[PDB]
């Protein structure tokens, strides 16, 4: 009864050393090597001494079919680069072969990515940790019976379905620059999962996430979307993130939180057009962490891999409440972080097309929808 919701949190961290060897193909922006860069960087910072590190299991087809269809999972187990010709029609109906190519060990990559998220949720359900971290997860675009946006198996939906075994209401927050369409779609008609996505909107992948998309049926008003423009910075992002999340916590009152920390919302991303720094990005982890709820932190987007390693290393230290110096320690990828070799980055001179009046107007309309909750 003496608890006040403070103190350092117990953090469990999931990582498989084989994740960095999976290769999407020549010229493909998604590079699972960024996860190994992140792991090696936080190891050289000494963060392994403050958290428990687990190697996730390979999620089975049964675990994946808790959401995905049997036909789509069977296709993922069978498709390989040496038999693509025989599956020419199946590759098209499941949206595999372009943005989501076939590569060696594709199904194993999905198992390692998904295994970390479901094992994190199990660890949270058993009340054996405060936070669970899986940077290989967060693949928020995967649909029930098709791939999308470099994502094949939606580890988030499976991890949330695992949390729903013991938690009445689960909150999902998506700070990836892209709309969390796969997660929102899976829980669009239920009030047991509330999805909140902040993203660039307007002539941008995936094309969903309009302000007026608020859910359907029993899930109406349980889907929140904050459409943004190019060039948003730390001050403008933090001006709306904390008050929006605070009101969601007050109205919805979840018992568990899932935070997708897509790094492609950082300044200088290969595919992103935002202007956030690592501190402004990590500020979102600080806000969610204050509420002292079972929190599952996941990865996601991020295609300037040197900044992805920076972002997820610092956000792990933030989860551990460990201050780390800005001078990067030596690591196996020290040359990737030139020419400064610092941990934190600086924003660009790009224009912030999100005026302060625009941010205040979108926030006010979201507050109207949040008033419609019991």
């Amino acid at each position: 009864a003496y608890s006040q919701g403070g103190g350092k949190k117990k953090v469990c961290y999931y990582y498989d050393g084989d994740i960095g060897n999976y290769y999407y193909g020549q010229g493909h922006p998604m590079k699972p090597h960024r996860i190994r860069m992140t792991h090696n960087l936080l190891l050289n910072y000494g963060l392994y001494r403050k958290m428990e590190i687990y190697r996730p299991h390979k999620a089975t087809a049964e675990e994946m079919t808790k959401y995905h269809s049997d036909e789509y999972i069977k296709f993922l187990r069978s498709i390989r680069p040496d038999n693509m010709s025989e599956y020419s029609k199946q590759m098209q109906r499941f949206n595999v072969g372009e943005d989501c190519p076939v590569f060696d060990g594709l199904f194993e990559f999905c198992q390692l990515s998904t295994g970390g998220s479901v094992a994190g949720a199990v660890k949270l359900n058993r009340q054996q940790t405060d936070m669970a971290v899986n940077w290989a997860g967060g693949l928020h675009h995967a649909k029930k019976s098709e791939a999308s946006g470099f994502c094949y198996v939606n580890d988030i939906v499976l991890a949330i379905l695992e949390l729903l075994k013991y938690h009445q209401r689960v909150l999902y927050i998506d700070i990836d620059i892209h709309h969390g369409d796969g997660v929102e779609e899976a829980f669009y008609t239920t009030d047991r999962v509330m999805t909140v996505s902040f993203h660039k909107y307007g002539e941008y992948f995936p094309g969903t996430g309009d302000l007026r998309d608020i859910g359907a049926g029993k899930g109406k008003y349980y889907a929140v979307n904050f459409p943004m423009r190019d060039g948003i910075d730390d001050e403008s992002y933090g001006q709306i993130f904390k008050p929006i999340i605070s009101k969601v916590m007050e109205m919805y009152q979840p018992s568990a939180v899932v935070l997708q920390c897509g790094a492609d919302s950082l300044s200088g991303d290969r595919l992103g057009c935002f202007n956030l720094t690592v501190k402004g990005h990590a500020k979102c982890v600080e806000v969610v962490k204050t509420f002292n709820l079972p929190l599952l932190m996941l990865g996601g987007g991020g295609y300037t891999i040197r900044n992805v390693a920076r972002c997820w290393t610092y956000e792990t230290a933030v989860a551990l409440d460990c201050e780390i110096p800005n001078e990067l320690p030596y690591n196996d990828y020290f040359e990737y972080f030139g020419p400064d070799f610092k941990l934190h980055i600086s924003p660009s001179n790009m224009t912030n097309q999100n005026t302060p009046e625009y941010m205040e107007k979108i926030k006010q309309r979201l507050f109207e929808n949040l008033r419609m909750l019991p």
Partner: peptide, 8 residues
């Protein structure tokens, strides 16, 4: 997703 290729 990728502006360099396709529609995603």
């Amino acid at each position: 997703x990728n502006p360099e290729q396709x529609w995603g």
